[PDB]
Design a binder for this molecule. Sequence first.
Ligand SMILES: COc1cc(-c2cnn(C)c2)ccc1Nc1ncc2ccnc(NCC(C)(C)C)c2n1
Ligand SMILES: COc1cc(-c2cnn(C)c2)ccc1Nc1ncc2ccnc(NCC(C)(C)C)c2n1
Lengths: 258, 258
Amino acid sequence: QSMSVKGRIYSILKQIGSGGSSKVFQVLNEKKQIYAIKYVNLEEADNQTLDSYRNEIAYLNKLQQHSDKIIRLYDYEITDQYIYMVMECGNIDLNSWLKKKKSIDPWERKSYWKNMLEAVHTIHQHGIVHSDLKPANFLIVDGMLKLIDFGIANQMQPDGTVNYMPPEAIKDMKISPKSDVWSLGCILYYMTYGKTPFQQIINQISKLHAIIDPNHEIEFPDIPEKDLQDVLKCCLKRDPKQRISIPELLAHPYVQIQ
Amino acid sequence: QSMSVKGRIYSILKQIGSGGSSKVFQVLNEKKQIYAIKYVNLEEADNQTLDSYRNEIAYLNKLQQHSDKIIRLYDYEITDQYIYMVMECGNIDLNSWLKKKKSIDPWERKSYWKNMLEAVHTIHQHGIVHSDLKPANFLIVDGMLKLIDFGIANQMQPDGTVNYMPPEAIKDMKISPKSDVWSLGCILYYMTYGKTPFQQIINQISKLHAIIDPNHEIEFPDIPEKDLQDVLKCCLKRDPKQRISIPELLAHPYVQIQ
Ligand SMILES: COc1cc(-c2cnn(C)c2)ccc1Nc1ncc2ccnc(NCC(C)(C)C)c2n1
Ligand SMILES: COc1cc(-c2cnn(C)c2)ccc1Nc1ncc2ccnc(NCC(C)(C)C)c2n1
């Protein structure tokens, strides 16, 4: 199999991920340089849906220059039937990496945390709040985490959880940059304790109650990294006004002191 | 490997499912009759947690005589460290069966629906509302669906979604027998259209908004079974007061007329 994007021919090596509409292929250029091509079938999309994709592509293009923690978009082809996005290819996504890895090095966890903060901070500056952050939104590209999507459009699975949901999103049934801080906090909590804060709960109705319940208390077992434990407690504050911000997290001893 | 339950020896053939605390083994008696042994490790459980398991076992024992649509519990062993439940062994659970099967026969769907209603109605009579219904709570035992658990205690996965959640569970952040009707309605909607009502949505915050949104409208594409389409529309009414009940669903032409 093969495909054409803006005149250039790419030969499909394999399919990386499956999406209801979207597909991601590991491809090779004539030069034989590797790339990831995201394909979106638009043949059943509405105007509102089309706009989200258009918005997401527009922000992806614009944010290229702003940070290197955002996945490289090299080119794209947009018609009425489909969208082709030529992106850099990563080694693996963070969710698949975390499932394969039992124990994670403290310097690896700190390096990944810093990258996540830089990527999320960049989007916040441009008025974008992801609101759907989870490990699957991060790509490992040569020991560096890069943010794959902005939450403006749809998501996929390789070839859905409420574990990273902030309390204010549930209580409002409101969402601000602080919502992204809670979700990042759950990703760091997982990379630290091997599990999300409310991962143990089975009943989904009960899990949602716990997240918004002031009385329910998250457990922060004592660890050698005292700075890391403080970050977790700061990110996982139920009141978004009292929750730590990203510019503050970037000035924290956990990120700054080695 | 082998295990002892109430004096009787069972040899483990294989592990069927994995739970954080619970485990399910396909075992053989000395007679060489097959059984499923559920093992629960209690070594880290609290009093409240212990009570739920005790309650769930007590209802499982009591409901044996009331319906054959509830999984057979033959024996059990309860100590301070663990719980062993000797149950009948099924062919496969409904979730695994639905993933393997692309198209389902209309008589198979109707037969399974009837069994589900009988099992859920039996629990409702004894004042139990499951509140966590999904295909994984149903076991296929010789062309008959049997309800595995009562939602009083924890759940497992073979060796978590918000897709079956009723609107009243979200709006109250209330739960009555009508909540179970919505979840059964989502299972039937899946067995009919091949997908849950809000399955397409990716953003979990957005999916929750849609479920409780009166304006959002579920799509009921025209099918040859007119009675089936009416049941779906009746089960998936957002107001629980206007939502159809189980005793009514048992009198519906879809269940009664062939
Ligand atoms: C060889 O490459 C890869 C391998 C794996 C991998 C290895 N094992 N498993 C289980 C998965 C994952 C990702 C990649 N690479 C890659 N590069 C660019 C992308 C751009 C957009 N979306 C992507 N993935 C969407 C997903 C998977 C997160 C839902 C991308 N994935
Ligand atoms: C051979 O037997 C089986 C095979 C499979 C099967 C086949 N393929 N896959 C993917 C799965 C599933 C279930 C059974 N049988 C069985 N019998 C009694 C049970 C009592 C309690 N919980 C059970 N399962 C818990 C679960 C899996 C729903 C989380 C029981 N499962």
